[PDB]
């Protein structure tokens, strides 16, 4: 004999279509700041973060639905912003016809602005207000909020640029560690700085150098090797390494600095086997690139004349292991762009509140 109720604090975990909310400007012609006026509402003027009292909820990071909601829109952002001159998407029907295409392609400006992902009517967003949350499992102090923090859609491989940093020690999160097929998203507790300048001597045009401090990088990776021995043994001799190979976009730390796609060289950045000045990254502006939005190459205009620079805040390390014993080889990875934003949407979850239960009391 069941008893229907209509007051229960019961929420499901549902999936819906969120709406963006960015701090736009509506006069600037920066190509992010012209999309953010077109498909984003402004920032919520009165934001409210109610802290739930004593509820613990089993989150999950790798099966989130915001990080495939986010991936639909930065695919839709890099189709209005950076229109290449020649684009070859492999349409197929071995008989795959490399369908060329052409359009206008002027040089534009490009910088990531923070974008909040809000929740529609009837849904909530449950923040994981903790410090040691390893991505999967019960968050203890789950608050609630309507919109996420300022997340900037910076697309890069091998190094999560410009992202937020952990207030506690260096976090290490993978979907299944000791799988040797899943990336290991390290997240920094301090912002390692990196300059990336194209010089002004007009002789090469497409050649740049990137300076990272030797004091900060040997100390920050000195923190990472300690907590990597937490999920591993205590006396493992881990070996950092160069990236293995593949395409240029994942062998080398690639990004886009003001409209020109840099391709750096982090072989001197992972060159140490761990036990118990300024590094110079030889970069190169490329012009025939692969695309991360889909399969297919794309060609752009030559770079602009003046000095090109962007000082940054590497706050992430998408490493990758390989399975021989008593050691570990940790070469860098990244490239699947969903890992570039689930490093920043890990403490969020969209739910909906369903207030109708049928408890046992066995009445009549």
């Amino acid at each position: 004999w069941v008893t229907v109720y209509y007051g229960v604090p019961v929420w499901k975990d549902a999936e819906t279509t969120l709406f963006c909310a960015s701090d736009a400007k509506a006069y600037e012609t920066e190509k992010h700041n012209v999309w953010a006026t077109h498909a984003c509402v402004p920032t919520d003027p009165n934001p409210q973060e109610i802290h739930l009292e004593n509820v613990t909820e089993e989150f999950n990071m790798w099966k989130n639905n915001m990080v495939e909601q986010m991936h639909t829109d930065i695919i839709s952002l890099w189709d209005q912003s950076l229109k290449p001159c020649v684009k070859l998407t492999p349409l197929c029907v071995i008989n795959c016809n490399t369908s060329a295409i052409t359009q206008a392609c002027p040089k534009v400006s490009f910088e990531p602005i923070p974008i909040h992902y809000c929740a529609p009517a009837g849904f909530a967003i449950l923040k994981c207000k903790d410090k040691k949350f390893n991505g999967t499992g019960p968050c203890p102090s789950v608050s609630t909020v309507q919109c996420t923090h300022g997340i900037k859609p910076v697309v890069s491989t091998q190094l999560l640029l410009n992202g937020s940093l952990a207030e506690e020690e260096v976090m290490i999160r993978s979907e299944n560690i000791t799988n040797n097929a899943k990336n290991i998203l390290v997240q920094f507790n301090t912002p390692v700085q990196i300059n990336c300048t194209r010089p002004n001597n007009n002789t090469d045009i497409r050649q740049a150098h990137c300076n990272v401090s030797k004091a900060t990088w040997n100390e920050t990776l000195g923190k990472v090797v300690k907590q990597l021995r937490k999920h591993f043994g205590n006396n493992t001799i881990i070996r950092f390494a160069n990236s293995s190979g593949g395409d240029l976009e994942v062998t080398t730390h690639s990004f886009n600095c003001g409209g020109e796609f840099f391709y750096c060289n982090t072989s001197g950045l992972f060159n140490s086997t761990w036990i118990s000045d300024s590094i110079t990254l030889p970069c190169r502006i490329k012009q025939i690139i692969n695309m991360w939005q889909r399969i297919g190459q794309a060609m752009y205009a030559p770079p602009i004349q003046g000095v090109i620079r962007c000082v940054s805040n590497i706050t992430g390390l998408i490493l990758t292991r390989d399975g021989n014993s008593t050691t570990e080889t940790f070469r860098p990875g990244g490239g699947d762009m969903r890992d570039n934003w689930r490093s920043e949407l890990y403490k969020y979850k969209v739910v909906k509140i369903e207030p109708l239960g049928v408890a046992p009391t066995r009445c009549k």
Binding site: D247, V250, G335
Partner: protein, 97 residues
């Protein structure tokens, strides 16, 4: 277990097939669990194996679900079985020189 016979130095196509046809992440390992290939989004990523300069895949077929591995310069010490992990279905394929 499927077995594919390639003689010497040629190119084989150790096929592997998905269902939903949307280029999900796969990999290719061996008996000691060492990575041969790897999909990363829309790019490709090798691993520290013996086929480091010998492995490649047909990129245009990933959108249809077929995720093959094509090894060139087939030497003698590549005889093993290979593990293609599409979603969970580790479809093993063995190779003989």
């Amino acid at each position: 277990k499927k077995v594919v016979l390639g003689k010497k130095g040629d190119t084989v196509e150790l096929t592997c097939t998905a269902s939903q046809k949307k280029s999900i992440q796969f990999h290719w390992k061996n008996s000691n669990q060492i990575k041969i290939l790897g999909n990363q989004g829309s790019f490709l990523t090798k691993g520290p194996s013996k086929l480091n300069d010998r492995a490649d895949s047909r990129r245009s077929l990933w959108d249809q679900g077929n995720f093959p591995l094509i090894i060139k310069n087939l030497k003698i010490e590549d005889s093993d079985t290979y593990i293609c992990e599409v979603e969970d279905q580790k479809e093993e394929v063995q190779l003989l020189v």
